[PDB]
Amino acid sequence: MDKVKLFQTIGRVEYWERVPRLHAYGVFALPFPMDPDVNWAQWFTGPHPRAFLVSIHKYGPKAGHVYPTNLTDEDALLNVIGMVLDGHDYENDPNVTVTLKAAVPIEYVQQDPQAPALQPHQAVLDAAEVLKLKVIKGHYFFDYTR
């Protein structure tokens, strides 16, 4: 208690797998400029694997820059282009690899950075038709190229 201090936990590192997609369906990715206004460091915090829908600016001064889709604005809902599966470091790259056509589970689509991981986000399902995500099983399906 005074001259001898016992064991005490210092560090804790946990490590996960990646976000699994279907082999049978296909992958298609085109890299995009990251919108510098949104706080990107919030979207890549936790060690849990996630993926989040991304909408592109159609026009304006930042035409071409992509940002995480806000589920409140219809001009941010209609121009959705894809979803970043893996994870990324905005402190070293303003150019993320947005996936256009893949097949990701409902469990691993989190549109909010403080939404709990490994749990299906509900507002994505209640905006599944506007965002053109067809749900047939757990796994989502999206082809924003067609």
Next chain:
Amino acid sequence: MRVPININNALARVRDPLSIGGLKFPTTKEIQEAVAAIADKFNQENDLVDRFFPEDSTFASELELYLLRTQDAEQTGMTFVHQVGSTSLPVEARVAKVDLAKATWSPLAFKESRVWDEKEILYLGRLADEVQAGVINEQIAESLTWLMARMRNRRRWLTWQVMRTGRITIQPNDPYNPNGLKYVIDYGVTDIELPLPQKFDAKDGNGNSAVDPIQYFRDLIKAATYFPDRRPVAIIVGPGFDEVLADNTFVQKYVEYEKGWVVGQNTVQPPREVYRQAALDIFKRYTGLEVMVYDKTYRDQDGSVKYWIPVGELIVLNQSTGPVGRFVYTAHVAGQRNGKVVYATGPYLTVKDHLQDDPPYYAIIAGFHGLPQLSGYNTEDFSFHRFKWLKYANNVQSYLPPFPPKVEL
């Protein structure tokens, strides 16, 4: 420390110089002389604990230990079901984790001094003989040996204190602490004591006992099955312990089961002495705990002899009989062998001459640095189940012969 006396001259100089009082003339007489030694034979040193903590020594002060633990995701899961002719679906995601930990250890310090002024060094003669000034030379050697034993007593005291209470506690109310340095060095023994609400020598009604000791150690061994380090091996109990096995109900019933001595049919009734001459053996056979005995004593300030293992209590070792860590010294200061400071490790003892100064004096100083350490800890939890105490009975002194007083003459 003996009185500086010559026994032959002192024993010869008591006889009367003239002393004609009886018959008005000196009588004839015969005189035989004999001396006597007086000591307390029952104040024996606590030899137990030095058998259990060995002595290593590090020059560095602090010791720390880092433990890396690793939990990996085991191969869980079940293969998915589908109809033939379909596609395939991906698996979930798994998680492995890694933590660390940190130990800490830090020694103590000890030192004490003597002094001898000029009047003591110059004037010291024997009490009956008439000799030169050469007695304080023989007198300082006893103080040297007493400081050596006085340091061995603190080694054995710290190690006995950690075996007794788990923590070691120093406080200003203590007798040998003038400094008043409060200390609580909690070594983190998990469960130091074993619970007994009703003790073994607790009888209700008419000779019926309350609990069962052989069954108590049996279900300690049974309820420490899947903890393979809490499962006890040995007992070191000091005083008369066979009597507590010989007077309680259940162990008497086990001796009567073994020897077949049903009281109405086989034999009349066996004496209590025939019980206690085999109760420990049948106890050892039905449990397997090798019971050691350790019955050395210390004369405390009451003037009443007490054992080192207190009566009514027995210690329990929990994994094996062996070294429970070790007692480790650290380094102190020895001055400039070449030009630079070069240390030393064991308990030191320094003498100082000041016989040239005003007034001449002379001081000896000894002391050391060190603290006990518990080496083997648990890995997955941070527990330490190696020794435990339990108080088994309350009235054990009545089973013991009395002790003599200390002769103060």
